[PDB]
Amino acid sequence: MNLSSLKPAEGAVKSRKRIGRGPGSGLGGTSTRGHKGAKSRSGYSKKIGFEGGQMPIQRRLPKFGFKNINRVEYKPINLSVLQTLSEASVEDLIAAGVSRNSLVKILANGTVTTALTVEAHAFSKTAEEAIVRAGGSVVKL
Amino acid sequence: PRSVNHVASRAKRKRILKLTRGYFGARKNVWTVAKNTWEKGLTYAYRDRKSKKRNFRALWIQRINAAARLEGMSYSRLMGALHANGIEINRKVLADLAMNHPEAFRAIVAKVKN
Amino acid sequence: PKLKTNSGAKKRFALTGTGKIKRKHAFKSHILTKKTKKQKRNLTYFSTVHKVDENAVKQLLCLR
Amino acid sequence: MELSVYNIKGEDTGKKVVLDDSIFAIEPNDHAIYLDVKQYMANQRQGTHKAKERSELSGSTRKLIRQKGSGGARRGDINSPLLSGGARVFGPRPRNYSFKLNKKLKALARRSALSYKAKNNEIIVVEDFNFDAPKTKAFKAISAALKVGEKKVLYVLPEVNKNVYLSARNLPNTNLILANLINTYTVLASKNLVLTERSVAVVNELFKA
RNA sequence: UAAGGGCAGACGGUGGAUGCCUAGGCUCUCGGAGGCGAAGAAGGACGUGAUAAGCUGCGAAAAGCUGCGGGAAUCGGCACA
RNA sequence: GCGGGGAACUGAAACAUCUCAUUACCCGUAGGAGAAGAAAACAAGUGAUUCCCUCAGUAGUGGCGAGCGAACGGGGAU
RNA sequence: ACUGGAAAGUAUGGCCGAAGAGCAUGAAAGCUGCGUAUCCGACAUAUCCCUGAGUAGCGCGGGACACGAAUCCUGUGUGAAUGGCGGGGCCCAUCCCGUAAGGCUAAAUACUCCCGAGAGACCGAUAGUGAACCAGUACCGUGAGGGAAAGGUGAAAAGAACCUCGAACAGAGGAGUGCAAUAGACCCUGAACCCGUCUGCCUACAAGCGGUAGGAGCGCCAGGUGUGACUGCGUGCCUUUUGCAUAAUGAACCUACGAGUUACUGUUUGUGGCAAGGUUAAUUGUUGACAAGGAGCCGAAGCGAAAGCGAGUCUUAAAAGGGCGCAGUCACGAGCAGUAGACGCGAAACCAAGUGAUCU
RNA sequence: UGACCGAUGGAGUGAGGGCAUGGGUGCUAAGGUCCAUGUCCGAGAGGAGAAGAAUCCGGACCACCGGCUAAGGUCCCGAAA
RNA sequence: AUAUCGGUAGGGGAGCAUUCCAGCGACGUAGAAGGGAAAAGGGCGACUUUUUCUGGAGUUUCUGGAAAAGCAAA
């Protein structure tokens, strides 16, 4: 093609909807609005959370809980991912192949079966047991 | 950009005004009166295309009745005899023969007047 | 401008892993006693938002 | 692919040049080309257009006639769109027509355009040349020797080349562009594409993969 | 018999639509500049021409006065002199 | 630009706290810009002001209603 | 050379190009004019030991801070210290940070009455500024104030000597100019509603939305066209309604004008690019385009109010006894939503600053 | 039959009315009023009943100067004894 | 092949015209746009072609793009 025979992909573009332009279009007259009432007027909007005067659900259910402003959240890395990284080094925590300046926690999802030297901020008990069974090392910092 | 379709807008009215020719008074040339008259006529034309078949069948039946009563039979008796003898000539052909070919109509009548 | 979150909704609702909305149970009568000890149904278990009432809590929490 | 270099006066010097297959020998993406051309034109747009709404007309806000008893239609202020010389409802507003395309999409579109040219055999490679003085007749002679004077031609140069640019400035169906500034619209706008020996290397090293 | 009337065509009238046109608007970009005035401002009044001045310019030295630099045949502002 | 006064219609499906809004408007007074600016600071190491992108519709606040709504940190201009 | 009133048009054939931007010229010009690319040019005139007291702090009443009672401010009443004091969201202790009650300071930021150079998938005379022209004019009002309409002969005025009718150009018919006067001053083009004349056909025994379907005769230019004796059927249209010929609403007619738009943020979907990754924002370089910018955002683990544990987790003394859990991302187009006047016209009113006692 | 059910995008409606049946109310009145079960008008043209929203017959893709029927009819207006 | 194709509110699909833009093709004083008359055409339609008179200088096809994108009633 060139600039004189441009073509988009089939179904990529579509004409917009135009209302109030006659009977043949199927969208004239009342222009998809119905007949009367509040919803047919210019400038109508929905009051969000308004149910006609009944007590709304966000007011009749109770508030619960509190959030911790000093919350430590780790990033879950599993043993199967650790194996995948190990298969094309031994000393792990390279993190350049994945997080970006965060705390990491090793969890037990697959298996290791290979001697690693995994270093991470925190570990699971099953993770440490699996590393020991595979004949590896755990460094926690 | 600013788009106004002056020529197309006027041509649409002029085409319909060409069809409203011959009407009475303002109905021939005054746009909102002429357009109103034209569409009612179109509904009339739709109904009249249906009623034309009824009218022409009634005319054929009346002419056949006259010719058969000349021959000494009524329309209903002639049609009963025709259907019993199983000939498939329709009412338009029978009326055309009755008005223009009386010898052929006489032949049809004599075949079934047994 | 960006859509604003409803403050009461953000204090009353939470999201789960599958995208379901969980909530606390309001009491029928909040004066316990003269109500059967089976009030653990509305006193112990978090419930979910009914599918019919859904999309309203979503619009309250900015369709999240 | 492999291309034969021509000299200034259109003779095959015999030296051959290699173009990257990942640039010049792919299956082009028509939708990518369409998107890139649309983005180029929308970025060229200057949306300086405006009409006056009701709040920016110059008439006063006084009610023209009393509400009841006059016998005509009820009227408010003079700036109403129903009145002659009134407000322009939903007219144009100043606009920014720029939109975003992914970098990989734009790169794929550029490669697709170059591959279209290479497949349709509208790419020719000439030797690098300099002009001692600006000479439109010299540039015209080069174009006629290369047989790209009948239609629109785009020259791709590796460096500034002030004299060459001045020589090519006044000719109608010729355009000049640096190799590192190649874009899909500029490639597609011209019928023929003349690369130089160093331009081939620059395009190959910069727009590969 | 058409007093008059109806329809169509042709040709006119009125009216000023449409098409084509315009430096009069609109929105911006870049660079400057960001004040005038008691040494009398902004904005006005009254004058000023060969022939009445409606604009423009000018101020009783009044469509104007002087010097230096540019330039070379017409000029004596505009509303069909 | 800075400063002195300062509404109401409206929204909350009524309305008084709240909102509209430290808006409209009135008044005073600069400059080519003005204001701010060099820690009795933020924080839980950074290092004067100003402006842009994020943080974030988050922390909070609120007839905890309608609504309002940061800062620290990071990336820049200088 | 051709056409033409007139070539810049067409067709040959040449030439310049650091100049093929443009405007004008009797139609559309690289080579007719002014210009353009490029180069050159200014006599002046401008511009470039000591350490901040009615202080810190405090009581009462208020205000600003995102905050509707920690920080900062103060009307009223009080009132120290010289390592001390202040802050880290009520209050105490430890710790950390800083050094109030004195002042000045460029840059990056906001705006356009004005001057200069440019631009537009902006308007083209009921549009676009109210104002293309005599425009804040005419007109209206005591006043504050409100506020229009109105562009186009022709390339060139060559803007019609003279004749005829007529009291007169009032107007016209000629002559003449001109490509054209049915371009003649209101002058390009010259539509509709509305108003006439001529020609053809019909019409003075006939009765309802005025048409529609049949169908003689007459009349024109070779199968088309005008009219139409006579026959059948037929209570306009819009809106609003359970339901309208309705005696419910609405319109004199024509031409022109007139009402779901745009921005941002969500969400769904059609089509695409990458893909366990996806994508840059402000901004920065080289010349709108290429290149750089990874800050940030989503995804990649969940459960629990939370500490926390983790393909588990919560509840329990303990139990599956029960609850919740064991391919994305970035765009382009489209639908919908919210916030903005948000599809258009229409109140009675409320508030602020002014103008009016020439009437009464 | 085919559209029943899930999940998702977009709605409109939330003034109904007549007839038949079972009832309440009223006066075993109302073209009354309130419910239930069907149906039609609403949103539905065509045929018969002189002319009638919902009574009887019957659900219109378009054309035809073809044929058969439904309700109801066959002396004339008016098709057929 | 069979079936289906009455429709208000309303949902869905596919297109015509208008103004301007890019690319590619064209037309015009041997007569453009506009105005009058006539003729033909389109699964269907919005509309499109052709001839002639007036007019006397601009217009248009195809593909894609963007909207001041269509009136009978307020």
Ligand SMILES: [K+]
């Ligand atoms: K300062």
Ligand SMILES: [K+]
């Ligand atoms: K010239």
Ligand SMILES: [K+]
């Ligand atoms: K003329």
Ligand SMILES: [K+]
């Ligand atoms: K002209």
Ligand SMILES: [K+]
């Ligand atoms: K005329």
Ligand SMILES: [K+]
């Ligand atoms: K008739």
Ligand SMILES: [K+]
């Ligand atoms: K009435």
Ligand SMILES: [K+]
């Ligand atoms: K007095």
Ligand SMILES: [K+]
């Ligand atoms: K009867």
Ligand SMILES: [K+]
């Ligand atoms: K009969």
Ligand SMILES: [Mg+2]
């Ligand atoms: Mg509909």
Ligand SMILES: [Mg+2]
């Ligand atoms: Mg309507």
Ligand SMILES: [Mg+2]
């Ligand atoms: Mg309505």
Ligand SMILES: [Mg+2]
């Ligand atoms: Mg209603």
Ligand SMILES: [Mg+2]
């Ligand atoms: Mg409604």
Ligand SMILES: [Mg+2]
């Ligand atoms: Mg309104």
